Amino acid sequence: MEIRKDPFTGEYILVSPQPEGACPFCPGAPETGRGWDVLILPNRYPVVTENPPEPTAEDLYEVIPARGSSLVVVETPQHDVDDLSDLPLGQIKKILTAVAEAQRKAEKEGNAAYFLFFRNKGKEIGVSLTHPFSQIYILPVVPPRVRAELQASYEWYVKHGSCLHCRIVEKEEKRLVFQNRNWKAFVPFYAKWPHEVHIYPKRHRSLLTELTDEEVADLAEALKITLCALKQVAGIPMPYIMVLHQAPLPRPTQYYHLHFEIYGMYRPDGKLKHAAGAELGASLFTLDTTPEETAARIKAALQKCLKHS
Amino acid sequence: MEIRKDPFTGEYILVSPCPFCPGAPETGRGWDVLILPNRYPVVTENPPEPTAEDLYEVIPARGSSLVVVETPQHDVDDLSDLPLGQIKKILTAVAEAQRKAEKEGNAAYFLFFRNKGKEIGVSLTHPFSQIYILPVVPPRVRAELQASYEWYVKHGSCLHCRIVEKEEKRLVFQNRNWKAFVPFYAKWPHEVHIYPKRHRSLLTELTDEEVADLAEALKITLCALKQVAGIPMPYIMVLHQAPLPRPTQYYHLHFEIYGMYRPDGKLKHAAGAELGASLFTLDTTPEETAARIKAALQKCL
Numbered sequence: 001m002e003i004r005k006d007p008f009t010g011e012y013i014l015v016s017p018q019p020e021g022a023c024p025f026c027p028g029a030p031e032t033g034r035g036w037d038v039l040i041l042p043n044r045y046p047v048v049t050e051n052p053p054e055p056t057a058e059d060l061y062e063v064i065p066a067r068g069s070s071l072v073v074v075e076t077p078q079h080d081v082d083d084l085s086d087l088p089l090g091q092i093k094k095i096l097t098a099v100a101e102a103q104r105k106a107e108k109e110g111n112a113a114y115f116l117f118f119r120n121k122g123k124e125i126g127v128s129l130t131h132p133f134s135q136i137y138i139l140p141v142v143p144p145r146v147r148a149e150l151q152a153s154y155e156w157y158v159k160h161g162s163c164l165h166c167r168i169v170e171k172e173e174k175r176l177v178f179q180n181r182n183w184k185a186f187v188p189f190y191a192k193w194p195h196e197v198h199i200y201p202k203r204h205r206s207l208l209t210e211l212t213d214e215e216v217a218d219l220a221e222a223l224k225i226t227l228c229a230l231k232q233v234a235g236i237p238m239p240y241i242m243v244l245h246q247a248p249l250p251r252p253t254q255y256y257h258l259h260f261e262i263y264g265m266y267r268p269d270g271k272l273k274h275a276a277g278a279e280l281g282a283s284l285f286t287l288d289t290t291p292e293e294t295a296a297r298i299k300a301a302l303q304k305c306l307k308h309s
Numbered sequence: 310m311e312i313r314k315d316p317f318t319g320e321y322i323l324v325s326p327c328p329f330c331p332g333a334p335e336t337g338r339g340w341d342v343l344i345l346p347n348r349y350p351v352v353t354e355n356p357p358e359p360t361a362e363d364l365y366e367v368i369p370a371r372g373s374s375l376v377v378v379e380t381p382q383h384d385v386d387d388l389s390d391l392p393l394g395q396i397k398k399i400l401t402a403v404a405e406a407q408r409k410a411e412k413e414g415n416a417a418y419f420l421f422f423r424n425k426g427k428e429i430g431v432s433l434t435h436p437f438s439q440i441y442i443l444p445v446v447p448p449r450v451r452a453e454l455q456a457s458y459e460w461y462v463k464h465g466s467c468l469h470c471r472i473v474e475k476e477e478k479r480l481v482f483q484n485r486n487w488k489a490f491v492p493f494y495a496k497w498p499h500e501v502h503i504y505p506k507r508h509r510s511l512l513t514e515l516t517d518e519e520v521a522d523l524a525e526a527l528k529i530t531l532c533a534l535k536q537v538a539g540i541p542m543p544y545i546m547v548l549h550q551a552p553l554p555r556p557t558q559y560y561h562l563h564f565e566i567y568g569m570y571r572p573d574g575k576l577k578h579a580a581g582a583e584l585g586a587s588l589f590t591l592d593t594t595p596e597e598t599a600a601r602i603k604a605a606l607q608k609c610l
């Protein structure tokens with residue numbers, strides 16, 4: 001068990017070699033207990049652990065200890081909820097608060113380079129467990145996609161003197177799908193996935209742990225309303241991926257701005273999109289619909305999720 | 310229609326808003342291999358003026374999107390099922406298409422790739438592969454070029470040459486001209502890379518004997534991947550080669566094959582870790598996977 005590094009790309013590989021049908025995440029399961037609104041608990045099959053073994057060493061290759069934590073965020077005690085967006089605003093706020101508290105703990109641990117929060121949703125993208133949950137990896141390395149974003153963000157800031165993310169968030173109007181006092185959700189110009197929405201704080205924040213209580217309440221709303229729109233823009237619930245892009249631990253950055261990326265994986269025609277030869281083999285992406293048309297369609301659908309605006 | 314560029318990653322988005330049987334309108338009859346224009350091209354010879362926005366880089370979607378119709382036979386399941394002679398005709402046709410793209414001198418890159426399996430979205434059941442002739446280098450290839458060059462400056466040799474010479478434990482197949490191995494840095498559940506033993510940068514540099522031996526290495530390697538998980542496995546194949554049209558001492562062409570079943574025969578999906586973070590997980594070592602693929606490969610010999 002170790003973290004191997006691709007010497008051509010710098011990518012990391014995490015090499016980590018109850019009755020049937022029972023839910024491991026329901027209240028009363030062996031590791032969950034009872035009387036909780038949100039539970040963060042150790043992953044049964046952890047990609048990273050507090051006490052990783054000596055890594056497998058080969059002469060031409062870099063290997064590092066799989067030192068870290070792999071956590072499951074059990075989002076609600078209720079098993080029969082299709083999506084995060086079906087939970088009340090107050091419950092989503094408790095989920096975000098618990099994830100932030102976990103990150104504050106990680107920000108004390110010298111071994112943690114990165115706090116990666118992500119969510120996979122839908123049987124069609126490999127999620128077999130039906131209980132609402134998300135994942136945290138506390139890692140000894142910065143995830144390669146976030147490293148690339150940090151390096152470009154830094155170079156821009158040094159070259160141009162301002163945060164590029166701040167400039168993008170200020171400009172977004174045509175592709176905006178939702179905004180509140182603290183958050184803007186928009187289809188980026190450079191969208192790659194069939195329904196892609198980025199959620200940014202209007203104030204420059206680079207760590208989840210910088211967010212005020214009000215910002216977290218407004219975040220819960222932006223997540224609920226954006227995911228609600230995705231659930232119906234195609235007529236049936238859409239599988240999606242959500243990832244939090246933030247600074248590395250433990251210190252705020254002037255040049256990087258945190259954001260949630262959401263990849264809705266149905267085309268406008270309800271056809272599932274699979275990352276294949278172009279995407280995985282070349283890092284080339286294709287769209288059969290403009291980001292501008294996709295923003296308009298998401299925004300129209302999203303009107304049916306609004307309570308007062 | 311245009312190529313958009315992510316300002317944070319450099320990634321390019323091609324924004325572009327049975328047909329392959331003998332007798333159909335675009336195919337005709339009497340052919341073994343056809344290379345024809347894609348009906349929905351992501352790049353074209355006559356792209357329109359790109360959609361511009363002030364903070365972003367946009368490029369005209371200029372190039373070619375081609376379908377390689379591998380056989381006139383509809384009910385062939387995999388490239389590996391075809392006879393060596395037919396696989397040689399496919400590879401020869403693809404190299405002839407690259408020679409034209411080299412001589413015409415507009416394109417930056419010739420990307421040859423194959424998607425196989427209903428489970429990864431290949432609804433068309435007639436065997437085919439694809440070519441994108443592009444005005445940009447694919448970002449994954451650009452990252453490999455940069456790393457290959459920096460190794461070359463620091464060490465004086467081709468890193469790919471050093472890797473190929475060292476591979477034994479994870480070797481699944483070799484012949485006079487090619488080595489197929491599970492890389493130490495594999496990211497997909499069944500991943501095999503096929504390298505020429507001679508340093509070659511471009512598909513167009515391969516001799517006829519190297520093409521014949523490549524047909525053999527692909528047929529046998531894909532035969533093994535078809536059987537290793539106990540049912541035919543969906544896979545992605547991509548050719549990583551230099552940008553057009555000159556070779557280099559520091560970059561070495563290879564095929565990467567991503568077999569997308571875990572050892573249990575269940576589909577691996579690229580999701581939040583892979584697509585969100587460029588982070589990859591393996592529940593089996595590359596070494597154990599190479600042993601299983603090599604064992605399966607012995608039956609294919």
Ligand SMILES: O=c1ccn([C@@H]2O[C@H](COP(=O)(O)OP(=O)(O)O)[C@@H](O)[C@H]2O)c(=O)[nH]1
Nearest residue numbers: 024042043044045046047070072129135590
């Ligand atoms: O009893 C279980 C069943 C599942 N999971 C976790 O739920 C996630 C499902 O996704 P996946 O196997 O792809 O995650 P990874 O293991 O790679 O982090 C996995 O991490 C599981 O190990 C768990 O902690 N306990």
Ligand SMILES: O=c1ccn([C@@H]2O[C@H](COP(=O)(O)OP(=O)(O)O)[C@@H](O)[C@H]2O)c(=O)[nH]1
Nearest residue numbers: 286328346347348349350351374376433439
């Ligand atoms: O009548 C058809 C049906 C399909 N295809 C091609 O088969 C490939 C299937 O993959 P995909 O649609 O995902 O490819 P892309 O278009 O993005 O290049 C596509 O290129 C199709 O356009 C075609 O040329 N004609």
Ligand SMILES: [Fe+3]
Nearest residue numbers: 149245259261
């Ligand atoms: Fe990002």
Ligand SMILES: [Fe+3]
Nearest residue numbers: 008453549565
């Ligand atoms: Fe490669």
Ligand SMILES: [Zn+2]
Nearest residue numbers: 023026079131
């Ligand atoms: Zn449950």
Ligand SMILES: [Zn+2]
Nearest residue numbers: 163166204257
């Ligand atoms: Zn900012």
Ligand SMILES: [Zn+2]
Nearest residue numbers: 327330383435
């Ligand atoms: Zn056909």
Ligand SMILES: [Zn+2]
Nearest residue numbers: 467470508561
């Ligand atoms: Zn070489």
